[PDB]
Write a protein that binds this ligand. Structure first.
Ligand SMILES: CC(=O)N[C@@H](Cc1ccccc1Cl)C(=O)N1CCC[C@]12C=C[C@@H]1CC[C@@H](C(=O)N[C@@H]3C(=O)N4[C@@H](C=C[C@H]3C)CC[C@H]4C(=O)O)N1C2=O
Length: 110
């Protein structure tokens, strides 16, 4: 059904707009294995990340056509939906490059 097109190590966060600070996605600070999954049948893509320690799914969001993916730095990238701002604090530049490669690919073929 879905094919993983990358795996990247990152601390996944979401922005608490009310208190003006980042907070760990899913409630607990730590690193996750973050995929982009391609549903090849419908040509849709989503970001899915699971905490290394306990496998909790901490992010599961769609990547819509036209998304503005902000590579704020070489190791912190972020984007928006209509509700949330998501951030990936990558474990290394190599991880960031892997994920950004796949994201930019998705945004080209959507
Ligand atoms: C128009 C728009 O939507 N603009 C958005 C950005 C954007 C532009 C275009 C498309 C989509 C998006 Cl998403 C915006 O500006 N946003 C999105 C919410 C957050 C922010 C607003 C305020 C704060 C000020 C500081 C800055 C920030 O978060 N910097 C990071 C940082 O402080 N940290 C993270 C790492 C490194 C740094 C780079 C690790 C954790 C923490 C830390 O180091 O402790 N901010 C933003 O980026």
């Amino acid at each position: 059904s879905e094919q993983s097109i990358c795996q990247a190590r990152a601390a996944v966060m979401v922005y608490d707009d009310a208190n003006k600070k980042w907070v760990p996605a899913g409630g607990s600070t730590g690193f996750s294995r973050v995929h982009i999954y391609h549903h090849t049948g419908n040509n849709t893509f989503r970001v899915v990340g699971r905490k290394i320690q306990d496998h909790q799914v901490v992010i599961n969001c769609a990547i819509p056509k036209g998304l503005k993916y902000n590579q704020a730095t070489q190791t912190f990238h972020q984007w928006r939906d209509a509700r949330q701002v998501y951030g990936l604090n990558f474990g290394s530049k190599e991880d960031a490059n892997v994920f950004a490669s796949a994201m930019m690919h998705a945004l080209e073929v959507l």
